[PDB]
Write an enzyme that holds these catalytic residues in place. Structure first.
Site, PDB file in Angstrom:
ATOM      1  N   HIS A 208      40.931  43.019  39.455  1.00  0.00           N
ATOM      2  CA  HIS A 208      41.175  43.224  38.031  1.00  0.00           C
ATOM      3  C   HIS A 208      40.428  44.399  37.421  1.00  0.00           C
ATOM      4  O   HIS A 208      40.905  45.002  36.460  1.00  0.00           O
ATOM      5  CB  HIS A 208      40.877  41.953  37.233  1.00  0.00           C
ATOM      6  CG  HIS A 208      42.018  40.986  37.212  1.00  0.00           C
ATOM      7  ND1 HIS A 208      42.159  40.018  36.243  1.00  0.00           N
ATOM      8  CD2 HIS A 208      43.085  40.852  38.036  1.00  0.00           C
ATOM      9  CE1 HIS A 208      43.265  39.331  36.467  1.00  0.00           C
ATOM     10  NE2 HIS A 208      43.845  39.816  37.550  1.00  0.00           N
TER      11      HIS A 208
ATOM     12  N   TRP B 171      46.734  27.876  46.795  1.00  0.00           N
ATOM     13  CA  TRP B 171      47.886  28.388  47.527  1.00  0.00           C
ATOM     14  C   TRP B 171      47.897  27.826  48.945  1.00  0.00           C
ATOM     15  O   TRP B 171      48.935  27.803  49.601  1.00  0.00           O
ATOM     16  CB  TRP B 171      47.831  29.915  47.608  1.00  0.00           C
ATOM     17  CG  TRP B 171      48.123  30.624  46.320  1.00  0.00           C
ATOM     18  CD1 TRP B 171      49.349  31.000  45.849  1.00  0.00           C
ATOM     19  CD2 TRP B 171      47.167  31.068  45.349  1.00  0.00           C
ATOM     20  NE1 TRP B 171      49.215  31.654  44.645  1.00  0.00           N
ATOM     21  CE2 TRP B 171      47.886  31.709  44.316  1.00  0.00           C
ATOM     22  CE3 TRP B 171      45.771  30.988  45.253  1.00  0.00           C
ATOM     23  CZ2 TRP B 171      47.257  32.267  43.200  1.00  0.00           C
ATOM     24  CZ3 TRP B 171      45.144  31.545  44.142  1.00  0.00           C
ATOM     25  CH2 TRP B 171      45.888  32.176  43.130  1.00  0.00           C
TER      26      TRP B 171
ATOM     27  N   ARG C 279      38.904  38.635  43.106  1.00  0.00           N
ATOM     28  CA  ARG C 279      39.736  38.831  41.929  1.00  0.00           C
ATOM     29  C   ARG C 279      39.081  39.782  40.934  1.00  0.00           C
ATOM     30  O   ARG C 279      39.766  40.560  40.273  1.00  0.00           O
ATOM     31  CB  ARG C 279      40.051  37.501  41.238  1.00  0.00           C
ATOM     32  CG  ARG C 279      41.173  37.667  40.225  1.00  0.00           C
ATOM     33  CD  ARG C 279      41.539  36.395  39.491  1.00  0.00           C
ATOM     34  NE  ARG C 279      42.898  36.509  38.966  1.00  0.00           N
ATOM     35  CZ  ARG C 279      43.247  36.287  37.704  1.00  0.00           C
ATOM     36  NH1 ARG C 279      42.335  35.930  36.808  1.00  0.00           N
ATOM     37  NH2 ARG C 279      44.513  36.435  37.338  1.00  0.00           N
TER      38      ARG C 279
HETATM   39  C1  HIF Z   1      51.797  39.984  41.280  1.00  0.00           C
HETATM   40  C2  HIF Z   1      50.397  40.241  40.937  1.00  0.00           C
HETATM   41  C3  HIF Z   1      49.466  39.213  40.736  1.00  0.00           C
HETATM   42  C4  HIF Z   1      49.530  38.217  39.801  1.00  0.00           C
HETATM   43  C5  HIF Z   1      50.617  38.018  38.750  1.00  0.00           C
HETATM   44  C6  HIF Z   1      48.349  37.383  39.960  1.00  0.00           C
HETATM   45  C7  HIF Z   1      48.090  36.261  39.183  1.00  0.00           C
HETATM   46  C8  HIF Z   1      47.023  35.398  39.406  1.00  0.00           C
HETATM   47  N1  HIF Z   1      46.055  35.552  40.407  1.00  0.00           N
HETATM   48 FE1  HIF Z   1      45.887  37.036  41.748  1.00  0.00          FE
HETATM   49  N2  HIF Z   1      45.642  38.619  42.932  1.00  0.00           N
HETATM   50  C9  HIF Z   1      44.519  38.893  43.713  1.00  0.00           C
HETATM   51  C10 HIF Z   1      43.444  38.046  43.971  1.00  0.00           C
HETATM   52  C11 HIF Z   1      43.321  36.777  43.389  1.00  0.00           C
HETATM   53  C12 HIF Z   1      42.318  35.784  43.747  1.00  0.00           C
HETATM   54  C13 HIF Z   1      41.314  35.939  44.885  1.00  0.00           C
HETATM   55  C14 HIF Z   1      42.479  34.706  42.921  1.00  0.00           C
HETATM   56  C15 HIF Z   1      41.667  33.405  42.942  1.00  0.00           C
HETATM   57  C16 HIF Z   1      40.572  33.444  41.879  1.00  0.00           C
HETATM   58  C17 HIF Z   1      39.702  32.200  41.865  1.00  0.00           C
HETATM   59  O1  HIF Z   1      38.794  32.131  41.007  1.00  0.00           O
HETATM   60  O2  HIF Z   1      39.915  31.298  42.707  1.00  0.00           O
HETATM   61  C18 HIF Z   1      43.606  35.022  42.051  1.00  0.00           C
HETATM   62  C19 HIF Z   1      44.058  34.215  41.015  1.00  0.00           C
HETATM   63  C20 HIF Z   1      45.193  34.474  40.241  1.00  0.00           C
HETATM   64  C21 HIF Z   1      45.624  33.658  39.126  1.00  0.00           C
HETATM   65  C22 HIF Z   1      44.922  32.403  38.620  1.00  0.00           C
HETATM   66  C23 HIF Z   1      43.671  32.698  37.807  1.00  0.00           C
HETATM   67  C24 HIF Z   1      42.930  31.436  37.426  1.00  0.00           C
HETATM   68  O3  HIF Z   1      43.563  30.541  36.830  1.00  0.00           O
HETATM   69  O4  HIF Z   1      41.720  31.341  37.723  1.00  0.00           O
HETATM   70  C25 HIF Z   1      46.754  34.215  38.620  1.00  0.00           C
HETATM   71  C26 HIF Z   1      47.600  33.665  37.477  1.00  0.00           C
HETATM   72  N3  HIF Z   1      44.160  36.257  42.402  1.00  0.00           N
HETATM   73  C27 HIF Z   1      44.557  40.207  44.542  1.00  0.00           C
HETATM   74  O5  HIF Z   1      43.759  40.715  45.213  1.00  0.00           O
HETATM   75  C28 HIF Z   1      46.090  40.535  44.356  1.00  0.00           C
HETATM   76  C29 HIF Z   1      46.247  42.143  43.980  1.00  0.00           C
HETATM   77  C30 HIF Z   1      46.764  40.252  45.611  1.00  0.00           C
HETATM   78  C31 HIF Z   1      46.902  38.850  46.078  1.00  0.00           C
HETATM   79  C32 HIF Z   1      46.570  39.635  43.169  1.00  0.00           C
HETATM   80  C33 HIF Z   1      47.774  39.814  42.508  1.00  0.00           C
HETATM   81  C34 HIF Z   1      48.238  38.989  41.492  1.00  0.00           C
HETATM   82  N4  HIF Z   1      47.570  37.846  41.022  1.00  0.00           N
END
Ligand code: HIF
Length: 294
Positions: free
Chosen positions: A52, A191, A48
């Site tokens: 970001h 998820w 993530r």
């Molecule tokens: C539509 C676009 C996206 C949205 C709106 C979006 C929202 C969230 N994402 Fe995420 N994301 C990617 C990787 C990861 C990962 C990994 C996490 C888990 C982080 C963790 O600490 O477990 C992770 C957590 C969260 C969380 C929760 C954060 C928290 O509470 O800790 C939110 C709300 N994401 C990408 O690589 C990507 C680009 C593709 C799947 C991508 C696209 C989007 N993501």
């Protein structure tokens, strides 16, 4: 302001071997600090962080992006959208201390590549050359996506990062990793079951689980299944939109295709905004610790 051009500049005298050592240090620490986040490990948060720090990019004027490694500045690391990523940055601190020669952007992006590969995901070619830029080049908050929107929002959002439908759906498979934490984003739950193993579980869960639209403890709507899984409204939009749905079904039925497409899209995401000289080294494909017998 005229469109800035960011030319990749290889860290002085460094080559594949130097970066493999950084990859290894990251991979070894991932293995060591396995208790993090109730034993999920730092893999997901590092992925993530890579996303970001790259997702602030705007194709229109080349602002933001992975090149500058600007997350090291307060404006960006305090971005509400980045709540929780400080854990990933802290993890990389000892790594950067040992290899002070690597740029911040190269480290943030490499962290994501290392995490995906070590979690048994596809190999992701990675290129070095990002150069740290000044604090005034830090992008303002608000460039990262909201999670309470629909398919139209998602599609439009990713056009700014020059990603098409297939690229978006492929990238989303990364949500098979980690979980949402109420205190960070206002959403709670994983998820899937294999939180720290990279597979196409995200797509199978979207299609096979029985989802119910509920309100979490932060008074935000999210889709929950009796299995203990959840989906953000933006995740669920992938099966509400007919075009996205077709692609979700494809990846749910072809693990190899998902791996190949994700690898291409993720490298692209991490390289957006960077101009690689014609004589720049070819992309590096790092060996996992397992492949090295380490
Ligand atoms: C539509 C676009 C996206 C949205 C709106 C979006 C929202 C969230 N994402 Fe995420 N994301 C990617 C990787 C990861 C990962 C990994 C996490 C888990 C982080 C963790 O600490 O477990 C992770 C957590 C969260 C969380 C929760 C954060 C928290 O509470 O800790 C939110 C709300 N994401 C990408 O690589 C990507 C680009 C593709 C799947 C991508 C696209 C989007 N993501």
């Amino acid at each position: 302001t005229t469109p800035l051009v960011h030319v990749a500049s290889v860290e002085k005298g460094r080559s594949y071997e130097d970066f493999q050592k950084v990859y290894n240090a990251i991979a070894l620490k991932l293995r060591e600090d396995d208790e993090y986040d109730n034993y999920i490990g730092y893999g997901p948060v590092l992925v993530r962080l890579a996303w970001h720090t790259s997702g602030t990019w705007d194709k229109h004027d080349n602002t933001g992006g992975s090149y500058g490694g600007t997350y090291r500045f307060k404006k960006e690391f305090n971005d509400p959208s980045n709540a929780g990523l400080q854990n990933g940055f802290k993890f990389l601190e000892p790594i950067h201390k040992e290899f002070p020669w690597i740029s911040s952007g190269d480290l943030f992006s490499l962290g994501g590549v290392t995490a995906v590969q070590e979690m048994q995901g596809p190999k992701i070619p990675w290129r070095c050359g990002r150069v740290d830029t000044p604090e005034d080049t830090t992008p303002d908050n608000g460039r990262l996506p909201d999670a309470d929107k629909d398919a139209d929002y998602v599609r439009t959002f990713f056009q700014r990062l020059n990603m098409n439908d297939r690229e978006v759906v492929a990238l989303m498979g990364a949500h098979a990793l980690g979980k949402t934490h109420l205190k960070n984003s206002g959403y709670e739950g994983p998820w899937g079951a294999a939180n720290n193993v990279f597979t196409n579980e995200f797509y199978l869960n979207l299609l096979n689980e029985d989802w119910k639209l509920e309100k979490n403890d932060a008074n935000n709507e999210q889709w929950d299944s009796k299995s203990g899984y959840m989906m953000l409204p933006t995740d669920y939009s992938l099966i509400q939109d007919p075009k996205y749905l077709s692609i979700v079904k494809e990846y749910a039925n072809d693990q190899d295709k998902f791996f190949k497409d994700f690898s291409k899209a993720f490298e692209k995401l991490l390289e957006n905004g960077i101009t690689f000289p014609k004589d720049a080294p070819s992309p590096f494909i790092f060996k996992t610790l397992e492949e090295q017998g380490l």
